[PDB]
Short mmCIF file of N, CA and C in Angstrom, two decimals:
data_model
loop_
_atom_site.label_atom_id
_atom_site.label_comp_id
_atom_site.label_asym_id
_atom_site.label_seq_id
_atom_site.Cartn_x
_atom_site.Cartn_y
_atom_site.Cartn_z
N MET Z 1 -89.74 28.61 82.34
CA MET Z 1 -89.24 28.38 83.72
C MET Z 1 -89.04 26.89 84.01
N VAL Z 2 -87.87 26.55 84.53
CA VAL Z 2 -87.57 25.16 84.86
C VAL Z 2 -86.57 25.04 86.01
N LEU Z 3 -86.92 24.24 87.01
CA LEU Z 3 -86.06 24.01 88.16
C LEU Z 3 -85.56 22.58 88.10
N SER Z 4 -84.33 22.36 88.57
CA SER Z 4 -83.78 21.02 88.60
C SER Z 4 -84.48 20.29 89.74
N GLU Z 5 -84.27 18.98 89.84
CA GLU Z 5 -84.87 18.20 90.91
C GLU Z 5 -84.24 18.64 92.23
N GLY Z 6 -82.94 18.92 92.18
CA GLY Z 6 -82.24 19.36 93.36
C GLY Z 6 -82.79 20.70 93.80
N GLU Z 7 -83.18 21.53 92.85
CA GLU Z 7 -83.74 22.83 93.20
C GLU Z 7 -85.11 22.69 93.83
N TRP Z 8 -85.93 21.78 93.31
CA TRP Z 8 -87.25 21.56 93.88
C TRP Z 8 -87.11 21.02 95.29
N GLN Z 9 -86.09 20.20 95.51
CA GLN Z 9 -85.85 19.62 96.84
C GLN Z 9 -85.43 20.70 97.82
N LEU Z 10 -84.73 21.72 97.34
CA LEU Z 10 -84.35 22.82 98.21
C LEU Z 10 -85.64 23.54 98.60
N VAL Z 11 -86.52 23.74 97.63
CA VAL Z 11 -87.80 24.40 97.87
C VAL Z 11 -88.65 23.59 98.85
N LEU Z 12 -88.79 22.29 98.57
CA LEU Z 12 -89.58 21.43 99.43
C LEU Z 12 -88.97 21.28 100.83
N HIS Z 13 -87.65 21.36 100.91
CA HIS Z 13 -86.96 21.24 102.18
C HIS Z 13 -87.32 22.43 103.08
N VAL Z 14 -87.21 23.65 102.56
CA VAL Z 14 -87.54 24.81 103.37
C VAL Z 14 -89.04 24.83 103.70
N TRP Z 15 -89.85 24.32 102.77
CA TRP Z 15 -91.29 24.32 102.98
C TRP Z 15 -91.77 23.43 104.13
N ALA Z 16 -91.01 22.38 104.42
CA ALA Z 16 -91.35 21.48 105.52
C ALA Z 16 -91.20 22.28 106.81
N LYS Z 17 -90.26 23.21 106.80
CA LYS Z 17 -90.00 24.07 107.96
C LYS Z 17 -91.12 25.07 108.13
N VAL Z 18 -91.70 25.51 107.02
CA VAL Z 18 -92.81 26.45 107.06
C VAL Z 18 -93.99 25.72 107.69
N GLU Z 19 -94.19 24.46 107.29
CA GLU Z 19 -95.28 23.66 107.80
C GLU Z 19 -95.17 23.35 109.30
N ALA Z 20 -94.02 23.64 109.89
CA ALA Z 20 -93.81 23.40 111.32
C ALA Z 20 -94.53 24.50 112.10
N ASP Z 21 -94.92 25.55 111.39
CA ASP Z 21 -95.60 26.66 112.01
C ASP Z 21 -96.17 27.55 110.91
N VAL Z 22 -97.12 27.00 110.17
CA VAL Z 22 -97.76 27.72 109.08
C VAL Z 22 -98.33 29.05 109.55
N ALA Z 23 -99.06 29.01 110.67
CA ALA Z 23 -99.69 30.20 111.24
C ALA Z 23 -98.71 31.34 111.50
N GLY Z 24 -97.59 31.03 112.16
CA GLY Z 24 -96.59 32.05 112.44
C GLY Z 24 -95.96 32.61 111.17
N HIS Z 25 -95.70 31.73 110.20
CA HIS Z 25 -95.12 32.15 108.92
C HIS Z 25 -96.11 33.03 108.16
N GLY Z 26 -97.39 32.64 108.19
CA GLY Z 26 -98.40 33.41 107.48
C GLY Z 26 -98.55 34.82 108.03
N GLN Z 27 -98.42 34.96 109.34
CA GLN Z 27 -98.53 36.26 110.00
C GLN Z 27 -97.32 37.12 109.66
N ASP Z 28 -96.14 36.52 109.67
CA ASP Z 28 -94.93 37.26 109.34
C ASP Z 28 -95.03 37.75 107.91
N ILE Z 29 -95.36 36.84 107.00
CA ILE Z 29 -95.46 37.16 105.59
C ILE Z 29 -96.51 38.23 105.31
N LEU Z 30 -97.73 38.04 105.81
CA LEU Z 30 -98.79 39.02 105.57
C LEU Z 30 -98.49 40.41 106.14
N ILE Z 31 -97.92 40.46 107.34
CA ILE Z 31 -97.59 41.74 107.97
C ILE Z 31 -96.48 42.44 107.19
N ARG Z 32 -95.51 41.66 106.75
CA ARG Z 32 -94.39 42.17 105.97
C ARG Z 32 -94.97 42.80 104.70
N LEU Z 33 -95.94 42.12 104.10
CA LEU Z 33 -96.59 42.60 102.89
C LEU Z 33 -97.38 43.89 103.11
N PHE Z 34 -98.16 43.94 104.18
CA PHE Z 34 -98.97 45.12 104.45
C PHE Z 34 -98.13 46.30 104.91
N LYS Z 35 -96.97 46.03 105.50
CA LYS Z 35 -96.09 47.10 105.96
C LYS Z 35 -95.28 47.69 104.80
N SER Z 36 -94.94 46.83 103.84
CA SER Z 36 -94.17 47.23 102.67
C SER Z 36 -95.09 47.87 101.62
N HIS Z 37 -96.31 47.35 101.53
CA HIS Z 37 -97.29 47.83 100.55
C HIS Z 37 -98.69 47.96 101.16
N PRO Z 38 -98.93 49.03 101.94
CA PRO Z 38 -100.22 49.28 102.60
C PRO Z 38 -101.47 49.27 101.71
N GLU Z 39 -101.32 49.58 100.43
CA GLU Z 39 -102.47 49.59 99.53
C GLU Z 39 -103.06 48.20 99.38
N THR Z 40 -102.20 47.19 99.50
CA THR Z 40 -102.64 45.82 99.37
C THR Z 40 -103.66 45.47 100.45
N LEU Z 41 -103.57 46.16 101.58
CA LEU Z 41 -104.47 45.94 102.72
C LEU Z 41 -105.93 46.21 102.37
N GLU Z 42 -106.14 47.14 101.45
CA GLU Z 42 -107.47 47.53 101.01
C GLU Z 42 -108.25 46.39 100.36
N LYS Z 43 -107.53 45.38 99.89
CA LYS Z 43 -108.17 44.24 99.23
C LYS Z 43 -108.77 43.21 100.20
N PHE Z 44 -108.73 43.50 101.50
CA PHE Z 44 -109.26 42.56 102.49
C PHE Z 44 -110.26 43.19 103.46
N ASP Z 45 -111.54 43.14 103.10
CA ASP Z 45 -112.61 43.72 103.90
C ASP Z 45 -112.71 43.23 105.34
N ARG Z 46 -112.24 42.02 105.61
CA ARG Z 46 -112.32 41.47 106.96
C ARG Z 46 -111.28 42.02 107.93
N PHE Z 47 -110.18 42.55 107.40
CA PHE Z 47 -109.15 43.12 108.25
C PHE Z 47 -108.42 44.29 107.60
N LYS Z 48 -109.11 45.03 106.74
CA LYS Z 48 -108.50 46.18 106.08
C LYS Z 48 -108.47 47.36 107.05
N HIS Z 49 -109.09 47.18 108.21
CA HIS Z 49 -109.11 48.22 109.23
C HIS Z 49 -107.99 48.03 110.24
N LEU Z 50 -107.09 47.09 109.95
CA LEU Z 50 -105.95 46.83 110.82
C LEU Z 50 -104.87 47.84 110.46
N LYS Z 51 -104.34 48.53 111.46
CA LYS Z 51 -103.30 49.54 111.24
C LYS Z 51 -101.94 49.21 111.83
N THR Z 52 -101.92 48.76 113.08
CA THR Z 52 -100.66 48.43 113.73
C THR Z 52 -100.29 46.96 113.63
N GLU Z 53 -99.00 46.69 113.82
CA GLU Z 53 -98.49 45.34 113.76
C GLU Z 53 -99.13 44.58 114.91
N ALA Z 54 -99.39 45.29 116.00
CA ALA Z 54 -100.02 44.69 117.17
C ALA Z 54 -101.42 44.22 116.78
N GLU Z 55 -102.18 45.11 116.14
CA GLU Z 55 -103.53 44.79 115.68
C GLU Z 55 -103.47 43.65 114.66
N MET Z 56 -102.39 43.61 113.89
CA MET Z 56 -102.21 42.59 112.87
C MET Z 56 -101.91 41.22 113.48
N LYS Z 57 -101.07 41.21 114.52
CA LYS Z 57 -100.71 39.96 115.18
C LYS Z 57 -101.88 39.39 115.97
N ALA Z 58 -102.78 40.27 116.40
CA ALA Z 58 -103.94 39.85 117.18
C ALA Z 58 -105.12 39.47 116.30
N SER Z 59 -105.03 39.77 115.01
CA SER Z 59 -106.12 39.47 114.08
C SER Z 59 -106.27 37.98 113.76
N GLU Z 60 -107.46 37.45 114.00
CA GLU Z 60 -107.75 36.05 113.72
C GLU Z 60 -107.98 35.91 112.21
N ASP Z 61 -108.56 36.94 111.61
CA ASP Z 61 -108.80 36.93 110.16
C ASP Z 61 -107.49 36.85 109.37
N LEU Z 62 -106.51 37.64 109.77
CA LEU Z 62 -105.22 37.66 109.10
C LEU Z 62 -104.52 36.32 109.32
N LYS Z 63 -104.56 35.83 110.55
CA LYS Z 63 -103.92 34.55 110.86
C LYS Z 63 -104.51 33.45 109.99
N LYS Z 64 -105.84 33.35 109.98
CA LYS Z 64 -106.52 32.32 109.19
C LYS Z 64 -106.24 32.49 107.71
N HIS Z 65 -106.18 33.74 107.27
CA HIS Z 65 -105.91 34.01 105.87
C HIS Z 65 -104.50 33.54 105.52
N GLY Z 66 -103.55 33.82 106.40
CA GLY Z 66 -102.18 33.40 106.15
C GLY Z 66 -102.09 31.89 106.01
N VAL Z 67 -102.83 31.17 106.85
CA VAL Z 67 -102.83 29.72 106.81
C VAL Z 67 -103.43 29.21 105.50
N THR Z 68 -104.49 29.86 105.03
CA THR Z 68 -105.12 29.43 103.79
C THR Z 68 -104.20 29.68 102.59
N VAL Z 69 -103.54 30.84 102.58
CA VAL Z 69 -102.62 31.20 101.50
C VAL Z 69 -101.43 30.24 101.40
N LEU Z 70 -100.78 30.00 102.53
CA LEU Z 70 -99.63 29.13 102.59
C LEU Z 70 -99.97 27.66 102.32
N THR Z 71 -101.15 27.23 102.77
CA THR Z 71 -101.58 25.86 102.55
C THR Z 71 -101.77 25.62 101.05
N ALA Z 72 -102.43 26.56 100.38
CA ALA Z 72 -102.67 26.45 98.94
C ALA Z 72 -101.35 26.52 98.17
N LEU Z 73 -100.42 27.33 98.65
CA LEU Z 73 -99.12 27.47 98.01
C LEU Z 73 -98.30 26.20 98.21
N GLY Z 74 -98.29 25.71 99.44
CA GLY Z 74 -97.56 24.49 99.75
C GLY Z 74 -98.02 23.33 98.89
N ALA Z 75 -99.30 23.31 98.55
CA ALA Z 75 -99.85 22.24 97.73
C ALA Z 75 -99.39 22.36 96.27
N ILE Z 76 -99.24 23.59 95.80
CA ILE Z 76 -98.80 23.83 94.43
C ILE Z 76 -97.31 23.56 94.26
N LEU Z 77 -96.52 23.91 95.27
CA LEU Z 77 -95.08 23.71 95.23
C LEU Z 77 -94.71 22.24 95.22
N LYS Z 78 -95.49 21.44 95.94
CA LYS Z 78 -95.22 20.01 96.01
C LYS Z 78 -95.46 19.33 94.67
N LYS Z 79 -96.12 20.04 93.75
CA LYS Z 79 -96.39 19.50 92.42
C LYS Z 79 -95.15 19.65 91.55
N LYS Z 80 -94.22 20.48 92.01
CA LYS Z 80 -92.97 20.71 91.30
C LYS Z 80 -93.16 21.04 89.82
N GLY Z 81 -94.14 21.88 89.51
CA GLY Z 81 -94.35 22.25 88.12
C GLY Z 81 -95.62 21.73 87.48
N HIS Z 82 -96.07 20.55 87.87
CA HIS Z 82 -97.30 19.99 87.30
C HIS Z 82 -98.42 20.32 88.27
N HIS Z 83 -98.73 21.61 88.37
CA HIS Z 83 -99.73 22.11 89.30
C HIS Z 83 -100.96 22.70 88.61
N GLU Z 84 -101.22 22.28 87.38
CA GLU Z 84 -102.35 22.80 86.64
C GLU Z 84 -103.66 22.64 87.43
N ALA Z 85 -103.92 21.43 87.90
CA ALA Z 85 -105.14 21.14 88.66
C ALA Z 85 -105.26 21.95 89.94
N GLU Z 86 -104.12 22.27 90.57
CA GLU Z 86 -104.13 23.04 91.81
C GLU Z 86 -103.99 24.53 91.52
N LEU Z 87 -104.16 24.92 90.26
CA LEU Z 87 -104.02 26.32 89.87
C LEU Z 87 -105.22 26.92 89.12
N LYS Z 88 -105.81 26.14 88.21
CA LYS Z 88 -106.98 26.60 87.45
C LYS Z 88 -107.94 27.35 88.39
N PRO Z 89 -108.13 26.83 89.61
CA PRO Z 89 -109.01 27.42 90.64
C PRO Z 89 -108.40 28.62 91.38
N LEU Z 90 -107.11 28.55 91.74
CA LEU Z 90 -106.45 29.66 92.44
C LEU Z 90 -106.53 30.89 91.52
N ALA Z 91 -106.91 30.65 90.27
CA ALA Z 91 -107.04 31.69 89.26
C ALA Z 91 -108.46 32.20 89.12
N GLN Z 92 -109.37 31.35 88.65
CA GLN Z 92 -110.77 31.73 88.47
C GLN Z 92 -111.24 32.61 89.61
N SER Z 93 -110.68 32.38 90.79
CA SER Z 93 -110.99 33.14 91.99
C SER Z 93 -110.53 34.61 91.88
N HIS Z 94 -109.27 34.83 92.22
CA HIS Z 94 -108.59 36.14 92.23
C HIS Z 94 -108.69 36.89 90.92
N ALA Z 95 -109.31 36.24 89.95
CA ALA Z 95 -109.51 36.85 88.67
C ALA Z 95 -110.91 37.46 88.63
N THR Z 96 -111.90 36.62 88.90
CA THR Z 96 -113.28 37.07 88.86
C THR Z 96 -113.88 37.44 90.21
N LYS Z 97 -113.31 36.92 91.29
CA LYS Z 97 -113.83 37.17 92.63
C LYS Z 97 -113.21 38.32 93.43
N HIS Z 98 -111.88 38.41 93.44
CA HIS Z 98 -111.21 39.46 94.20
C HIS Z 98 -110.51 40.47 93.30
N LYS Z 99 -109.99 39.99 92.17
CA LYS Z 99 -109.29 40.84 91.22
C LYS Z 99 -107.92 41.23 91.81
N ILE Z 100 -107.11 40.22 92.14
CA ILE Z 100 -105.78 40.43 92.70
C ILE Z 100 -104.72 40.62 91.60
N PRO Z 101 -104.17 41.83 91.49
CA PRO Z 101 -103.15 42.17 90.49
C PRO Z 101 -101.90 41.28 90.51
N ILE Z 102 -101.32 41.07 89.34
CA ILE Z 102 -100.10 40.28 89.21
C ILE Z 102 -99.02 40.92 90.05
N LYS Z 103 -98.95 42.25 90.02
CA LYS Z 103 -97.94 42.97 90.79
C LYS Z 103 -98.01 42.64 92.29
N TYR Z 104 -99.22 42.42 92.80
CA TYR Z 104 -99.39 42.09 94.22
C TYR Z 104 -98.78 40.72 94.52
N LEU Z 105 -98.90 39.80 93.57
CA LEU Z 105 -98.31 38.47 93.72
C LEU Z 105 -96.79 38.62 93.79
N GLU Z 106 -96.26 39.62 93.09
CA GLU Z 106 -94.83 39.89 93.11
C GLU Z 106 -94.47 40.44 94.49
N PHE Z 107 -95.39 41.18 95.09
CA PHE Z 107 -95.16 41.75 96.42
C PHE Z 107 -95.11 40.67 97.49
N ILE Z 108 -96.03 39.71 97.41
CA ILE Z 108 -96.08 38.63 98.39
C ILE Z 108 -94.94 37.64 98.23
N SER Z 109 -94.41 37.53 97.01
CA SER Z 109 -93.28 36.65 96.75
C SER Z 109 -92.07 37.21 97.50
N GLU Z 110 -91.90 38.53 97.45
CA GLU Z 110 -90.80 39.20 98.14
C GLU Z 110 -90.92 39.01 99.66
N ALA Z 111 -92.15 39.08 100.17
CA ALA Z 111 -92.38 38.91 101.60
C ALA Z 111 -92.05 37.48 102.01
N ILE Z 112 -92.43 36.51 101.17
CA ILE Z 112 -92.16 35.10 101.44
C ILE Z 112 -90.66 34.80 101.51
N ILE Z 113 -89.91 35.27 100.53
CA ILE Z 113 -88.46 35.05 100.49
C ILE Z 113 -87.81 35.72 101.69
N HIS Z 114 -88.23 36.95 101.98
CA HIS Z 114 -87.67 37.68 103.12
C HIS Z 114 -87.92 36.95 104.42
N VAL Z 115 -89.16 36.52 104.64
CA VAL Z 115 -89.53 35.81 105.86
C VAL Z 115 -88.83 34.46 106.01
N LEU Z 116 -88.69 33.73 104.90
CA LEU Z 116 -88.03 32.43 104.94
C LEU Z 116 -86.56 32.59 105.27
N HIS Z 117 -85.96 33.64 104.72
CA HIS Z 117 -84.55 33.91 104.94
C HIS Z 117 -84.34 34.28 106.40
N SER Z 118 -85.21 35.14 106.91
CA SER Z 118 -85.17 35.61 108.29
C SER Z 118 -85.35 34.52 109.34
N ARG Z 119 -86.26 33.59 109.08
CA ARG Z 119 -86.54 32.52 110.03
C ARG Z 119 -85.68 31.27 109.87
N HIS Z 120 -85.06 31.10 108.70
CA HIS Z 120 -84.23 29.93 108.44
C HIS Z 120 -82.99 30.30 107.64
N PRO Z 121 -82.21 31.27 108.14
CA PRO Z 121 -80.99 31.73 107.47
C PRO Z 121 -79.88 30.70 107.32
N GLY Z 122 -79.86 29.70 108.19
CA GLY Z 122 -78.82 28.69 108.13
C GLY Z 122 -78.92 27.71 106.98
N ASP Z 123 -80.10 27.60 106.39
CA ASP Z 123 -80.31 26.67 105.28
C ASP Z 123 -80.86 27.36 104.04
N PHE Z 124 -81.60 28.44 104.24
CA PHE Z 124 -82.19 29.19 103.13
C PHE Z 124 -81.14 30.16 102.61
N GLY Z 125 -80.17 29.62 101.87
CA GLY Z 125 -79.09 30.42 101.32
C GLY Z 125 -79.36 30.90 99.91
N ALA Z 126 -78.32 31.29 99.19
CA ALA Z 126 -78.49 31.77 97.82
C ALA Z 126 -79.13 30.71 96.92
N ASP Z 127 -78.68 29.46 97.05
CA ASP Z 127 -79.24 28.37 96.24
C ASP Z 127 -80.74 28.18 96.49
N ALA Z 128 -81.10 28.07 97.77
CA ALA Z 128 -82.50 27.90 98.15
C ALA Z 128 -83.37 29.09 97.74
N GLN Z 129 -82.83 30.30 97.90
CA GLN Z 129 -83.56 31.51 97.54
C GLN Z 129 -83.76 31.61 96.04
N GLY Z 130 -82.75 31.17 95.29
CA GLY Z 130 -82.82 31.21 93.85
C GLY Z 130 -83.86 30.25 93.33
N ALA Z 131 -83.91 29.06 93.93
CA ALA Z 131 -84.88 28.04 93.54
C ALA Z 131 -86.30 28.49 93.91
N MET Z 132 -86.47 29.05 95.11
CA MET Z 132 -87.79 29.52 95.54
C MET Z 132 -88.24 30.64 94.64
N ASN Z 133 -87.33 31.54 94.29
CA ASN Z 133 -87.68 32.64 93.41
C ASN Z 133 -88.18 32.10 92.07
N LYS Z 134 -87.46 31.12 91.53
CA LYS Z 134 -87.85 30.52 90.26
C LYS Z 134 -89.21 29.85 90.40
N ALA Z 135 -89.42 29.19 91.53
CA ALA Z 135 -90.69 28.52 91.78
C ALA Z 135 -91.85 29.52 91.82
N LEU Z 136 -91.67 30.62 92.54
CA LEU Z 136 -92.73 31.63 92.64
C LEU Z 136 -92.92 32.39 91.32
N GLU Z 137 -91.86 32.48 90.53
CA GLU Z 137 -91.94 33.17 89.25
C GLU Z 137 -92.73 32.30 88.28
N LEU Z 138 -92.45 31.00 88.31
CA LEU Z 138 -93.17 30.05 87.46
C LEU Z 138 -94.65 30.17 87.83
N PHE Z 139 -94.90 30.20 89.13
CA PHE Z 139 -96.23 30.31 89.69
C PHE Z 139 -96.96 31.57 89.22
N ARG Z 140 -96.27 32.70 89.20
CA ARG Z 140 -96.91 33.93 88.77
C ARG Z 140 -97.26 33.88 87.29
N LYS Z 141 -96.34 33.36 86.48
CA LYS Z 141 -96.56 33.27 85.03
C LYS Z 141 -97.75 32.40 84.68
N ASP Z 142 -97.86 31.24 85.32
CA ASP Z 142 -98.98 30.35 85.04
C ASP Z 142 -100.30 30.98 85.44
N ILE Z 143 -100.30 31.70 86.56
CA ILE Z 143 -101.51 32.39 87.03
C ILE Z 143 -101.89 33.49 86.05
N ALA Z 144 -100.89 34.20 85.54
CA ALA Z 144 -101.13 35.28 84.58
C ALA Z 144 -101.65 34.69 83.27
N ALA Z 145 -101.23 33.47 82.97
CA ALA Z 145 -101.67 32.78 81.76
C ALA Z 145 -103.16 32.46 81.88
N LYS Z 146 -103.56 31.98 83.05
CA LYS Z 146 -104.96 31.66 83.29
C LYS Z 146 -105.79 32.94 83.23
N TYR Z 147 -105.26 34.02 83.79
CA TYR Z 147 -105.96 35.30 83.77
C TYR Z 147 -106.22 35.68 82.31
N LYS Z 148 -105.14 35.93 81.58
CA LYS Z 148 -105.19 36.29 80.17
C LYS Z 148 -106.12 35.35 79.42
N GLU Z 149 -105.96 34.05 79.66
CA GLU Z 149 -106.80 33.05 79.02
C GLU Z 149 -108.27 33.29 79.37
N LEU Z 150 -108.51 34.12 80.39
CA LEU Z 150 -109.88 34.43 80.83
C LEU Z 150 -110.29 35.90 80.68
N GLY Z 151 -109.54 36.67 79.91
CA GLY Z 151 -109.89 38.06 79.70
C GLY Z 151 -109.41 39.04 80.76
N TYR Z 152 -109.14 38.56 81.97
CA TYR Z 152 -108.66 39.43 83.04
C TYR Z 152 -107.22 39.85 82.77
N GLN Z 153 -106.95 41.15 82.91
CA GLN Z 153 -105.61 41.69 82.70
C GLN Z 153 -105.02 42.08 84.05
N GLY Z 154 -104.87 41.09 84.93
CA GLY Z 154 -104.34 41.32 86.26
C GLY Z 154 -103.12 42.21 86.39
#
């Protein structure tokens, strides 16, 4: 996986917009994920009892979780590929602590692209979406590498 500098800039450009309202983006993304794939909800004991979008939007746990997820992602994306140090840990965790499947990461990637497109359609075009997809794909592969490198078959 390799993105051009122009492609990383497209990614970083849309990401600055996400940072203008991390909380709102995290809620959109997480709800989109739980609505598209309800089984994923079972992996969160603090808000796995949330059923409606209303209950989801009112959840402080989901909101805070969205902010933590996006913050960690935003930090890895800014590395533009050299994110080993900001990844070794994002791995040891979901590998030994939560056991988050690779397929679920594919689910959240779809929610992220959908939400970014929906909230910023004027700039998040085919080029930007293609670069973000490549970025998240690179991200999934490296995480899967750390898993495998650690015995976990996510």
